[PDB]
Design an enzyme around this catalytic site. Structure first.
Site, PDB file in Angstrom:
ATOM      1  N   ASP A   7       0.927  -1.136   0.000  1.00 16.54           N
ATOM      2  CA  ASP A   7       0.000   0.000   0.000  1.00 16.54           C
ATOM      3  C   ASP A   7       0.977   1.199   0.000  1.00 16.54           C
ATOM      4  O   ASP A   7       1.379   1.707   1.050  1.00 16.54           O
ATOM      5  CB  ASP A   7      -0.807  -0.080   1.305  1.00 16.54           C
ATOM      6  CG  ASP A   7      -1.905   0.929   1.400  1.00 16.54           C
ATOM      7  OD1 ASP A   7      -2.053   1.817   0.546  1.00 16.54           O
ATOM      8  OD2 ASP A   7      -2.636   0.832   2.387  1.00 16.54           O
ATOM      9  N   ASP A  49      -2.145   5.405  -4.674  1.00 18.60           N
ATOM     10  CA  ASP A  49      -3.451   5.992  -4.913  1.00 18.60           C
ATOM     11  C   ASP A  49      -3.263   7.252  -5.765  1.00 18.60           C
ATOM     12  O   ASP A  49      -2.419   8.108  -5.469  1.00 18.60           O
ATOM     13  CB  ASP A  49      -4.127   6.328  -3.579  1.00 18.60           C
ATOM     14  CG  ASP A  49      -4.429   5.086  -2.729  1.00 18.60           C
ATOM     15  OD1 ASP A  49      -3.522   4.567  -2.058  1.00 18.60           O
ATOM     16  OD2 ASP A  49      -5.593   4.638  -2.693  1.00 18.60           O
ATOM     17  N   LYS A  64     -15.181  11.177   0.734  1.00 19.62           N
ATOM     18  CA  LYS A  64     -13.927  11.805   1.148  1.00 19.62           C
ATOM     19  C   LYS A  64     -13.905  13.322   1.067  1.00 19.62           C
ATOM     20  O   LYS A  64     -12.840  13.936   1.159  1.00 19.62           O
ATOM     21  CB  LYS A  64     -12.721  11.211   0.395  1.00 19.62           C
ATOM     22  CG  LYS A  64     -12.356   9.790   0.834  1.00 19.62           C
ATOM     23  CD  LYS A  64     -11.169   9.224   0.080  1.00 19.62           C
ATOM     24  CE  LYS A  64     -10.989   7.778   0.479  1.00 19.62           C
ATOM     25  NZ  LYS A  64      -9.851   7.083  -0.173  1.00 19.62           N
ATOM     26  N   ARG A  67     -11.848  15.406   3.428  1.00 20.66           N
ATOM     27  CA  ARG A  67     -10.419  15.495   3.125  1.00 20.66           C
ATOM     28  C   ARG A  67     -10.049  16.711   2.268  1.00 20.66           C
ATOM     29  O   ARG A  67      -8.902  17.165   2.286  1.00 20.66           O
ATOM     30  CB  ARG A  67      -9.879  14.172   2.540  1.00 20.66           C
ATOM     31  CG  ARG A  67      -9.788  13.050   3.593  1.00 20.66           C
ATOM     32  CD  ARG A  67      -9.175  11.755   3.048  1.00 20.66           C
ATOM     33  NE  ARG A  67      -9.626  10.572   3.792  1.00 20.66           N
ATOM     34  CZ  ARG A  67      -9.127   9.340   3.667  1.00 20.66           C
ATOM     35  NH1 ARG A  67      -8.129   9.091   2.828  1.00 20.66           N
ATOM     36  NH2 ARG A  67      -9.664   8.341   4.359  1.00 20.66           N
ATOM     37  N   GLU A 109      -8.676   3.243  -6.318  1.00 18.66           N
ATOM     38  CA  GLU A 109      -8.009   3.143  -5.028  1.00 18.66           C
ATOM     39  C   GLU A 109      -7.140   1.885  -4.991  1.00 18.66           C
ATOM     40  O   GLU A 109      -7.463   0.874  -5.610  1.00 18.66           O
ATOM     41  CB  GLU A 109      -9.049   3.114  -3.909  1.00 18.66           C
ATOM     42  CG  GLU A 109      -9.821   4.388  -3.808  1.00 18.66           C
ATOM     43  CD  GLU A 109     -10.766   4.411  -2.610  1.00 18.66           C
ATOM     44  OE1 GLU A 109     -10.307   4.681  -1.480  1.00 18.66           O
ATOM     45  OE2 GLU A 109     -11.977   4.170  -2.802  1.00 18.66           O
ATOM     46  N   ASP A 112      -8.833  -1.396  -4.006  1.00 24.54           N
ATOM     47  CA  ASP A 112      -9.617  -2.038  -5.052  1.00 24.54           C
ATOM     48  C   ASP A 112      -8.667  -2.816  -5.939  1.00 24.54           C
ATOM     49  O   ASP A 112      -9.008  -3.877  -6.428  1.00 24.54           O
ATOM     50  CB  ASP A 112     -10.377  -0.989  -5.861  1.00 24.54           C
ATOM     51  CG  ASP A 112     -11.425  -0.293  -5.045  1.00 24.54           C
ATOM     52  OD1 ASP A 112     -12.466  -0.930  -4.763  1.00 24.54           O
ATOM     53  OD2 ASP A 112     -11.228   0.874  -4.669  1.00 24.54           O
ATOM     54  N   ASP A 134      -3.598   0.462   7.269  1.00 22.75           N
ATOM     55  CA  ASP A 134      -5.022   0.684   7.100  1.00 22.75           C
ATOM     56  C   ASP A 134      -5.730  -0.632   7.382  1.00 22.75           C
ATOM     57  O   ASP A 134      -5.597  -1.573   6.597  1.00 22.75           O
ATOM     58  CB  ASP A 134      -5.300   1.085   5.647  1.00 22.75           C
ATOM     59  CG  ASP A 134      -6.763   1.432   5.393  1.00 22.75           C
ATOM     60  OD1 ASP A 134      -7.387   2.086   6.244  1.00 22.75           O
ATOM     61  OD2 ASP A 134      -7.295   1.071   4.326  1.00 22.75           O
ATOM     62  N   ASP A 136      -8.843  -1.324   7.102  1.00 14.42           N
ATOM     63  CA  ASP A 136      -9.914  -1.640   6.158  1.00 14.42           C
ATOM     64  C   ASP A 136      -9.421  -2.649   5.116  1.00 14.42           C
ATOM     65  O   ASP A 136     -10.211  -3.217   4.377  1.00 14.42           O
ATOM     66  CB  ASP A 136     -10.432  -0.392   5.447  1.00 14.42           C
ATOM     67  CG  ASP A 136     -10.975   0.629   6.399  1.00 14.42           C
ATOM     68  OD1 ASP A 136     -11.414   0.235   7.492  1.00 14.42           O
ATOM     69  OD2 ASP A 136     -10.949   1.830   6.053  1.00 14.42           O
ATOM     70  N   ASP A 182     -18.031   5.401   8.330  1.00 15.98           N
ATOM     71  CA  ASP A 182     -16.592   5.581   8.308  1.00 15.98           C
ATOM     72  C   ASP A 182     -16.281   7.070   8.305  1.00 15.98           C
ATOM     73  O   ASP A 182     -16.275   7.709   7.242  1.00 15.98           O
ATOM     74  CB  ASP A 182     -16.054   4.900   7.046  1.00 15.98           C
ATOM     75  CG  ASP A 182     -14.547   4.997   6.893  1.00 15.98           C
ATOM     76  OD1 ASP A 182     -13.883   5.807   7.578  1.00 15.98           O
ATOM     77  OD2 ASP A 182     -14.028   4.244   6.040  1.00 15.98           O
ATOM     78  N   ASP A 185     -13.517   8.585   5.898  1.00  9.07           N
ATOM     79  CA  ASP A 185     -13.877   8.605   4.487  1.00  9.07           C
ATOM     80  C   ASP A 185     -15.129   9.409   4.260  1.00  9.07           C
ATOM     81  O   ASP A 185     -15.612   9.521   3.130  1.00  9.07           O
ATOM     82  CB  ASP A 185     -14.034   7.181   3.955  1.00  9.07           C
ATOM     83  CG  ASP A 185     -12.690   6.500   3.696  1.00  9.07           C
ATOM     84  OD1 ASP A 185     -11.843   6.432   4.608  1.00  9.07           O
ATOM     85  OD2 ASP A 185     -12.472   6.015   2.569  1.00  9.07           O
TER      86      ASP A 185
END
Length: 271
Positions: A7, A49, A64, A67, A109, A112, A134, A136, A182, A185
């Site tokens: 990641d 990303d 998001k 952000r 992302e 994904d 992360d 998730d 979340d 996000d």
């Protein structure tokens, strides 16, 4: 021989978190190499990303959005520190290219993409190692797919679903994410229901979909009343947090052609 999926952006912020002034491109890559040894990585894949997610933005325009708010509010000096880090990460990603197959698909992302690789070739190896802080990414966890976090220097296996996530398995985790929401996000969840409360609902009635069939849930609690009137919310969130089910759709949102090329590239690597 295992497969290691990094990641990239995440690891980047970890370096940024350690020091927001220092160029990190060398250590970044050497860190991935030391790690590749460690996990007998036969194949190592780095992902970054690039841009917002097209898939989730379609199902939730405000995905998001916070952000962006955080950027708009930063001082001239913080915005500049932000840009420093971003140029340094691009550099980190450039250097990576000289050692490990790297990938950035704008509008897609890393998660994904990670889910697609695991799906695509996870079976060609003994174990798969997800390099992320992360949690998730833990929706990808199985008995052959584990995660490794630097911020904790820990490893996460499926047996560990409860202590680390307040649920028993990947499906329950997705359900909790869909019910709970979340914050980071900017995904809204049922008002008044968190990890423990959500978990107790799932443990009794089951996964989100099962719970949809069952609304109205018995209970005079306002968070229950709230729950009974969130059918739509749940359907929405589920597609946003269900990584393993929507990963392919998520890569194809940026094109059937891009999906086809990501595939050819992956298989050629695991060959």
């Amino acid at each position: 021989r295992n497969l290691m999926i990094v990641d990239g952006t995440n690891l980047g912020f970890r370096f940024k978190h350690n020091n927001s002034k220092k160029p990190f491109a060398s250590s970044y890559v050497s860190t991935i190499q030391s790690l590749a040894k460690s996990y007998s990585a036969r194949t190592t894949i780095v992902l970054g990303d690039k841009g917002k997610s097209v898939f989730r933005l379609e199902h939730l325009p405000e995905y998001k959005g916070n952000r962006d708010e955080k950027y708009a509010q930063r001082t001239e000096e913080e915005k500049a520190l932000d840009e420093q880090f971003f140029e340094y990460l691009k550099d980190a990603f450039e250097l990576c290219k000289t050692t490990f197959p790297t990938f950035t698909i704008r509008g897609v992302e890393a998660d994904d993409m990670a889910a697609y690789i695991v799906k695509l070739i996870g079976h060609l190896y003994d174990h798969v190692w997800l390099i992320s802080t992360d949690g998730d990414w833990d929706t990808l966890l199985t008995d052959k797919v584990s995660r490794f976090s630097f911020t904790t220097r820990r490893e996460y296996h499926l047996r560990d679903m409860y202590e680390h996530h307040n649920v028993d398995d990947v499906e329950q985790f997705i359900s909790l994410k869909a019910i709970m929401g979340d914050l980071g996000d900017n995904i809204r969840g049922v008002e008044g229901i968190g990890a423990k409360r959500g978990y107790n609902i799932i443990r009794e009635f089951g996964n989100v979909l099962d719970i949809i069939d069952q609304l109205p849930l018995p209970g005079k609690q306002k968070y229950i009343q709230n729950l009974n009137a969130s059918e739509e919310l749940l359907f929405r969130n589920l597609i946003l947090v269900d990584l393993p089910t929507y990963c392919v759709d998520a890569i194809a949102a940026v094109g059937q052609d891009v999906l086809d090329k990501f595939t050819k590239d992956i298989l050629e690597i695991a060959e």
